[PDB]
Structure 1
Amino acid sequence: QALQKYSTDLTARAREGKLDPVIGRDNEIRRVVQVLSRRTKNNPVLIGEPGVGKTAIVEGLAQRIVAGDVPESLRDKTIVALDLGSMVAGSKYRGEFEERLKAVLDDIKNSAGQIITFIDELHTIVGAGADAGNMIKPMLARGELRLVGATTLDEYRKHIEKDAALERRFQQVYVGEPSVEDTIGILRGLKDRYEVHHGVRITDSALVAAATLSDRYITARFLPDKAIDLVDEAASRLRMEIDSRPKEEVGPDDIADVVSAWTGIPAGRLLEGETAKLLRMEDELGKRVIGQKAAVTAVSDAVRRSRAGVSDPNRPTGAFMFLGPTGVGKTELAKALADFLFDDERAMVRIDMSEYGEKHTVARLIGAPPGYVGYEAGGQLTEAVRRRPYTVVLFDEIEKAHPDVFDVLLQVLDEGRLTDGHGRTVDFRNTILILTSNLGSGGSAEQVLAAVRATFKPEFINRLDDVLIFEGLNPEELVRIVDIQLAQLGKRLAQRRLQLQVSLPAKRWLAQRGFDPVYGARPLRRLVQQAIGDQLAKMLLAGQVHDGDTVPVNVSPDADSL
């Protein structure tokens, strides 16, 4: 009468059909049975990563016992699931939990050997001391109670393996996570409870899509379970849409929609509307960056190839290095791409390369080994890419860092791997890598290539894609970048109703000035600021110019005036 106010009954719960149809995993049930049906020390433990099917094995064993499919000395054994938390709840006295547990042990050993036990998460068996979880060590290595267990591979060696006299009485049954085909089989077996929990239909195509997708993009969970979340969420969403709100089944597009909305990745099959933007992508990107027509095409073809379904699935989506003269638009093109792809400017993870002149400064983007000052923090780059695994990474001006930092990303490129202090790997498999430089800076297409081959080693150039050479700035289209800067200033002048009437000779002079041939278009921003913003703030603070004054500008031969 003790192991019924402190225990459920899995066997009697299986007869009512209130369990799930465990599919597959025959070797594990066989080993559990052959370890549970020996003479002495017949206690198995199911070890494995979280969510790989540890309890489902015991549920399947219960169903097998109910159905009569076990060896001869396993018939009608009525496996029992204790809960050690409901025995340590009310006890504030000397010797209370001891009695509460001795009653259960005596009621187990009083009957014959048909009370097979099951303590889920038995890493909680070492507590309640004050001599607790230690009274069963006599009955363990005697074949009195069977004690089918299950615990995480990490919580095992943290709580149990410090009790080497207690972990001797347990046989470890390793449970690894299944493969994609096994997950598809499991889902096919389980695609009947959701179709009746929700009033919808589910397709084998959707099941296969979930099993294949969740393995490639959700890269921090295991795969009997990370694939059922997608099916359940898609069914719930489609039901909430179909009913009570002012193609009646889930398909291989809703799973991709869930995987895209959650964890922020454009994974899917290129629905309508995106294709239009991807065709009109080079012409659009060329609106913020002028010229460099030979380098926009490659970057655009990278993304088009990636989202078209033709690219190496385990490798970065692009590893372009482009270099050339100063002030030509390398980082500007990088920022333009980051803006066109995410509609936000801070989404890109930009790190400089002027601070890495010293060898020891690499620990900033890796981390620190165990036992050092900053170790629980981690690494800047690793943490920045663990979340938001879709940004672009700009290694700005990677020529100042001396040749020891290159070797770190030598395996970021070509594999998409990087580890930190804790030993966890992060994947740069769907991020566009970009690293600029200024090496060469004056030569032709054969003098700068010699500089590259002399400053880098052959095992580093071999990793990355096209080495783009940015061409100079053509004296004709210089007015257009001036129009770009003026439109930016006008957009800034939006909190008021101010407009501008810049004249053509004023534009000509603003383009000719601040365009040093050795510094490209660097001083143009500061020149526009000096010649417009200071005077406009003066005329706005000193009265005599209010809002809405669409005021023009002139040449004023020496200096630009109002």
Structure 2
Amino acid sequence: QALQKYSTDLTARAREGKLDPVIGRDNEIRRVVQVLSRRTKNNPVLIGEPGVGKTAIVEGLAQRIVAGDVPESLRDKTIVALDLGSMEFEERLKAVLDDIKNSAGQIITFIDELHTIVGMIKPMLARGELRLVGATTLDEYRKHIEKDAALERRFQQVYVGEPSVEDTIGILRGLKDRYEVHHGVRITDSALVAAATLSDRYITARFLPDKAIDLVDEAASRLRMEIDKEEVGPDDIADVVSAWTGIPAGRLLEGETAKLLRMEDELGKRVIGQKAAVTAVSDAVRRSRAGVSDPNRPTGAFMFLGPTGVGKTELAKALADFLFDDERAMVRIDMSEYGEKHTVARLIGQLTEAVRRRPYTVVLFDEIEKAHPDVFDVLLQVLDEGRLTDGHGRTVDFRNTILILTSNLGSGGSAEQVLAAVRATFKPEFINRLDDVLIFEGLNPEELVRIVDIQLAQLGKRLAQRRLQLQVSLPAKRWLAQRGFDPVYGARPLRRLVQQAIGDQLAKMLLAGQVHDGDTVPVNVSPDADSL
């Protein structure tokens, strides 16, 4: 009788249809019924990354009990959800435990978020009297419970995966009517597909269905603000996912055949030349969006190398620009530090727990020469299988990321001097697993003028705070090309030439007067240097 005062009653709320219908997941329900009906130590724990549905399984169990699809010795046993917030203390807890044990096992207790239970129930758990069902996140578990290894032996970890769109579309079609009544607006089912589709490739920090309900809610609120267009639609969902996360800035809904038709030429606005090694990078994206790709292999795993100062890092940051609308959402690890045989352990991990959250990021590997040939052994099952492990025992799948490898071997080999040097360090079981090894060339002084245009456009966009337009004449614009010289160091000394010619006298004339906001600062060819 004492449980009337310190508990709710999910069965009593289920007996009037006040629970959202639970669709899917027969395996977890059968597993909970299997574990909860053994003889001793009969108390499972639901564990998964948050948002994948763990309360929904217990509510589905309550629905299935009140319906009656259970076996014989589980029928009509009400699930009394306990508390520890609402709950002299030791007397009260002993009264609760005595009231549970006084019954004949007719009650299934339910402590939700049981990682607060640490802060006298220990002998009662192992004997098998009180049946207990819980739900933790995966990462509060190892902080609050696994510290206290006497407790965690008396549980049964029931892992629950997570993701899925096809059932979330049904959930969103179900809960459509409730928000139309609170906010007096209509919601169109055309937008209700997009609010779950578009919320998977952009917002990759929370888990699923609750993340795809906040968009509908905040879109309805913004529409009520504008009605202070009589229904929401697929545009305001994009407005919300722009204004939060600032994802609209980069791309702004850029995705369709019209984009991927122009990718060899759209990418040329930031990389000049190198044409035979953009027509291959621009091909592992088109064949993976047509559906011809090999379903157990990374979508593209290719290695490009050559001399220095060519654009081999600028390319791998430019094809991460229109896929993501940013340039910092990529896994950039640097293997220039793994000289010894025991820095494997920092990625086996720093490599692992940055993919499992959003499994779509492009991955760099900068200067793979300096790694000791033990890191290649770790990298060997990344290619051609797609999975590796870690301490926790999960096999993270690299089946749809674009691996990219950089190098500087040889750096000036004729035709085979650079290619046969690869065969020195790399064992042939690693050269075979790669895609087409790309060679970059040097740079031509015919194709070196336009880099100066790009650099001066960059410096113009840097001075957008001051509204300080600057005028560059064509004789100076070709004067900067001729000091771009000596094709050993690439186009990198040009980006010091610009800061030695323009930036010095401009930075002196900027902070002493005679240059102010909105002014125009033209440059003119003095007979040796650049004037002002």
Give TM-score, length-normalised by structure 2: 0.69
Counterpart position of 1:117: 109
1:304–1:98 Cα change, 3 Å:
same
1:78–1:385 Cα change, 3 Å:
closer
Question: Helix, strand or coil: the match of 2:354?
Answer: helix
Aligned partners of 1:234 and 1:258 also within 8 Å: yes
Counterpart position of 1:198: 183
Aligned positions of 1:73-222 closer than 5 A: 80-87=80-87, 96-97=88-89, 99-101=91-93, 103=95
How far apart are residue 286 of structure 1 and its match? 1.7
| Rounded Cα–Cα distance in structure 2 between residues aligned with 1:253 and 1:103 | 57
1:393–1:273 Cα change, 3 Å:
closer
1:287–1:203 Cα change, 3 Å:
closer
Which digits, 9 at most, give the CA deviation of each residue in 1:378-403, with x for residues without a partner?
x5555666777665444333333343
Question: Helix, strand or coil: the match of 1:321?
Answer: strand
What is the aligned-residue identity percentage?
A: 100
1:270–1:425 Cα change, 3 Å:
farther
The match for 1:282 among 264, 267, 281 is: 264
| Rounded Cα–Cα distance in structure 1 between residues aligned with 2:41 and 2:253 | 59
How far apart are residue 475 of structure 1 and its match? 3.4
Aligned partners of 2:321 and 2:327 also within 8 Å: yes
Aligned partners of 1:264 and 1:390 also within 8 Å: no
Aligned partners of 1:253 and 1:269 also within 8 Å: no
1:413–1:542 Cα change, 3 Å:
same
How far apart are residue 478 of structure 1 and its match? 2.6
1:211–1:384 Cα change, 3 Å:
closer
How far apart are residue 516 of structure 1 and its match? 0.3
1:267–1:190 Cα change, 3 Å:
farther
| Rounded Cα–Cα distance in structure 2 between residues aligned with 1:505 and 1:143 | 89
Counterpart position of 2:464: 494
1:204–1:449 Cα change, 3 Å:
farther
How far apart are residue 198 of structure 1 and its match? 8.0
Aligned partners of 2:41 and 2:126 also within 8 Å: yes
Question: Helix, strand or coil: the match of 1:256?
Answer: helix
Aligned partners of 1:319 and 1:434 also within 8 Å: yes
Counterpart position of 2:246: 264
Aligned partners of 1:231 and 1:255 also within 8 Å: yes
| Rounded Cα–Cα distance in structure 2 between residues aligned with 1:83 and 1:561 | 78
Unpaired runs of at least 5, structure 2: none
Which digits, 9 at most, give the CA deviation of each residue in 1:256-313, with x for residues without a partner?
9999998999999996776545444433322332211222233334444455666556
Aligned partners of 1:263 and 1:388 also within 8 Å: no
Query: Is the aligned partner of 1:49 residue 2:41?
Result: no
Aligned partners of 1:23 and 1:189 also within 8 Å: no
Aligned partners of 2:162 and 2:208 also within 8 Å: yes
Aligned partners of 1:325 and 1:441 also within 8 Å: yes
Question: Helix, strand or coil: the match of 2:260?
Answer: helix
1:309–1:24 Cα change, 3 Å:
closer
1:431–1:491 Cα change, 3 Å:
same
| Rounded Cα–Cα distance in structure 1 between residues aligned with 2:447 and 2:40 | 88
| Rounded Cα–Cα distance in structure 2 between residues aligned with 1:156 and 1:124 | 10
| Rounded Cα–Cα distance in structure 2 between residues aligned with 1:39 and 1:550 | 85
Question: Helix, strand or coil: the match of 1:525?
Answer: helix
**Mean Cα displacement is larger for which, 174-183 or 347-356?**
174-183
Which digits, 9 at most, give the CA deviation of each residue in 1:360-389, with x for residues without a partner?
4555555xxxxxxxxxxxx55556667776
Which digits, 9 at most, give the CA deviation of each residue in 1:96-152, with x for residues without a partner?
3454455556666778876665555667667xxxxxxx9789988999877677778
How far apart are residue 356 of structure 1 and its match? 4.0
Question: Helix, strand or coil: the match of 2:41?
Answer: coil
How far apart are residue 529 of structure 1 and its match? 3.0
Aligned partners of 1:121 and 1:149 also within 8 Å: yes
Aligned partners of 1:270 and 1:308 also within 8 Å: no
Counterpart position of 2:318: 336
Aligned partners of 1:397 and 1:438 also within 8 Å: yes
Instruction: Name the Cα RMSD after superposition.
Output: 5.9
Aligned partners of 1:48 and 1:176 also within 8 Å: yes
| Rounded Cα–Cα distance in structure 1 between residues aligned with 2:350 and 2:35 | 48
1:120–1:327 Cα change, 3 Å:
closer
Aligned partners of 2:367 and 2:406 also within 8 Å: yes
**Mean Cα displacement is larger for which, 400-409 or 74-83?**
74-83
| Rounded Cα–Cα distance in structure 1 between residues aligned with 2:467 and 2:242 | 40
Query: Is the aligned partner of 1:345 residue 2:327?
Result: yes
1:544–1:406 Cα change, 3 Å:
same
Counterpart position of 2:423: 453
Give TM-score, length-normalised by structure 1: 0.66
How far apart are residue 534 of structure 1 and its match? 3.1
Aligned partners of 1:21 and 1:189 also within 8 Å: no
How far apart are residue 323 of structure 1 and its match? 2.0
1:231–1:294 Cα change, 3 Å:
same
How far apart are residue 479 of structure 1 and its match? 2.4
Question: Helix, strand or coil: the match of 1:45?
Answer: strand
Which digits, 9 at most, give the CA deviation of each residue in 1:231-278, with x for residues without a partner?
8888888999999xxx99999999999999989999999967765454
Which digits, 9 at most, give the CA deviation of each residue in 1:183-240, with x for residues without a partner?
8888898888788888889999999999999999998988898888888888888999
Which digits, 9 at most, give the CA deviation of each residue in 1:29-79, with x for residues without a partner?
788779989999988877888667665565455556655777788776655
**Mean Cα displacement is larger for which, 192-201 or 12-21?**
192-201
1:318–1:177 Cα change, 3 Å:
closer
1:400–1:208 Cα change, 3 Å:
same
1:207–1:402 Cα change, 3 Å:
same
How far apart are residue 9 of structure 1 and its match? 3.7
1:34–1:199 Cα change, 3 Å:
farther
| Rounded Cα–Cα distance in structure 1 between residues aligned with 2:86 and 2:152 | 24
Aligned partners of 1:253 and 1:268 also within 8 Å: no
The match for 1:225 among 181, 206, 210 is: 210
